[PDB]
Every structure is written in structure tokens, then in C-alpha cells.
Ligand binder design. Structure first.
Ligand code: HEM
Ligand code: HEM
Ligand code: HEM
Ligand code: HEM
Length: 108
């Protein structure tokens, strides 16, 4: 059957700055905008699976860079921060909540 979203409260914890991901706040986003095509097939593996976004060098801006995939603009798929920047627009409160590097809903 079509895959179902998991429970809220999923911790992304590849790094020492873990972030909690809630599917319930991301329903307006098609599943494949995140679990994106790889070889033409929407891929439901963990983002940092070997051969995926497995480089824990936060300086790497090639596709395999995990930090890059979560923070950067101009990516083939929207990143967490990229989409949130667009969402917040000029609203400073939303910029803080959704894009702040600290004291945000990502990095609380
Ligand atoms: C769309 C309704 C949708 C589905 C289906 C889906 C499924 C899904 C599963 C099954 C997992 C768990 C994977 C595992 O084995 O741990 C999972 C995890 C994450 N998802 Fe998801 N997901 C759906 C939608 C979305 C959307 C729209 C996004 C992006 C805004 C998204 C993101 C994530 C993230 C991040 C994770 C955690 C993966 C990781 O830490 O490696 N999902 N999803
Ligand atoms: C996990 C939900 C997950 C996220 C989030 C994610 C994001 C992501 C972005 C933002 C890009 C674009 C980067 C750029 O520099 O343009 C991107 C690109 C690729 N990804 Fe990814 N990705 C997630 C999951 C996965 C998984 C599970 C794999 C490996 C099976 C994977 C692989 C790739 C590849 C390859 C690319 C480059 C585009 C292409 O060659 O297909 N991603 N991802
Ligand atoms: C990438 C894996 C990613 C993360 C991490 C993330 C986090 C996140 C948080 C913490 C919130 C606040 C709500 C909550 O506590 O769950 C939030 C809210 C929104 N997001 Fe997000 N988000 C990630 C990815 C994406 C992507 C790729 C998009 C757009 C394509 C997106 C969008 C949104 C929207 C919209 C919201 C709600 C905003 C509001 O004002 O409440 N996110 N996300
Ligand atoms: C603001 C532009 C901002 C910064 C800077 C930032 C930094 C940061 C670091 C240093 C890490 C850990 C990297 C490492 O490997 O040690 C990290 C990790 C994640 N972040 Fe972040 N972050 C900034 C902003 C945001 C925002 C607003 C979100 C959510 C939209 C977000 C998301 C993430 C995710 C996801 C991770 C990985 C969590 C994990 O797997 O441990 N960041 N960030």
C-alpha cells in the first residue's frame, strides 16, 4: 500500500545538533519533495544512508553533504532551511522561528 508517514517526534541525530522532524506540520509538501526520486524512484531511506547524504563534513557542498542538504539554497530539491526561508518571507518572527540558527524550532 502507499507508504504512511510515521509518528511525530522523529529525531534527526546524525550530528551533535539534533533536530526533531514532525510529519504533521509538513502535510502540504508532497512526500516525494523530501523522499525524493533517486534513479527515478522516490526513496524512503534515511537521508544519511551510505551513498546518500552521508558526508558529515559540514563544509561539503556537493550533494552528499548532509549539512548542505539540510541548510542550503539553490538545491535540486528544497532543503529544510531553503523552504523555510521562502515560507517566512519578510516576517521576522517567522524567520526566527523557522530559519534561526539558534533558538528556533529546528535548533531549540
Ligand atoms: C508523505 C505522506 C510522506 C511519507 C509517506 C513519509 C514517510 C516517511 C517514513 C516512512 C519515514 C521514516 C524513515 C525511516 O526508516 O526512519 C520518514 C522520515 C522522514 N521524513 Fe517523511 N514522509 C512523508 C513526507 C515527508 C516530507 C514532506 C518531508 C520533508 C518536508 C519528510 C521528511 C522526512 C525526514 C527528514 C525524515 C527523517 C529521515 C532521516 O532522519 O534520515 N517526509 N518519512
Ligand atoms: C531524506 C528525507 C533526504 C533529504 C532531506 C534529501 C535532500 C536532498 C537535497 C536537498 C538534494 C539536493 C542537493 C543539491 O546540491 O542540489 C538532494 C540530492 C540528492 N539526494 Fe537526497 N535527500 C534525502 C534522501 C536521499 C536518499 C535516501 C538518497 C540515497 C538513496 C539521496 C540521494 C541523493 C542524490 C543522489 C542526490 C543528487 C541528485 C541525483 O543524482 O539524484 N537522498 N537530496
Ligand atoms: C528538513 C528535514 C526540515 C526540517 C528539519 C523542518 C523542520 C520544521 C519545524 C521544526 C517546523 C515547525 C513546526 C514543528 O515543530 O514541526 C517546521 C514547519 C514548517 N515547515 Fe519544515 N522542516 C523541514 C523541511 C521543510 C521543507 C522542505 C518545507 C517546504 C518544502 C517545509 C515547510 C514547512 C512549513 C510550511 C512549516 C510550517 C510553518 C509555520 O509557520 O508553522 N519544511 N518545519
Ligand atoms: C542557521 C543558518 C543555522 C546554522 C548555522 C545551523 C547549524 C547547524 C549545525 C552546526 C549543525 C550540526 C552539523 C554537524 O555535523 O555538526 C546543524 C544540523 C542540522 N540542522 Fe541546522 N543550522 C541552522 C539552521 C537550521 C534550521 C532553521 C533548521 C531547520 C529548518 C536546521 C536543520 C538542521 C538539521 C536537520 C540538522 C541535522 C540534525 C542531525 O541529524 O543531527 N538548521 N545545523
Amino acid at each position: 500500500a502507499a507508504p504512511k508517514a510515521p509518528a511525530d517526534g522523529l529525531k534527526m541525530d546524525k550530528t551533535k545538533q539534533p533536530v526533531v522532524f514532525n510529519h504533521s506540520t509538513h502535510k502540504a509538501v508532497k512526500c516525494g519533495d523530501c523522499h525524493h526520486p533517486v534513479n527515478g524512484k522516490e526513496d524512503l531511506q534515511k537521508c544519511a544512508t551510505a551513498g546518500c547524504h552521508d558526508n558529515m563534513d559540514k563544509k561539503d557542498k556537493s550533494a552528499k553533504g548532509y549539512y548542505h542538504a539540510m541548510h542550503d539554497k539553490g538545491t535540486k530539491f528544497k532543503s529544510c532551511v531553503g523552504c523555510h526561508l521562502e515560507t517566512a518571507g519578510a516576517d521576522a518572527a517567522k524567520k526566527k522561528e523557522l530559519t534561526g540558527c539558534k533558538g528556533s524550532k529546528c535548533h531549540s
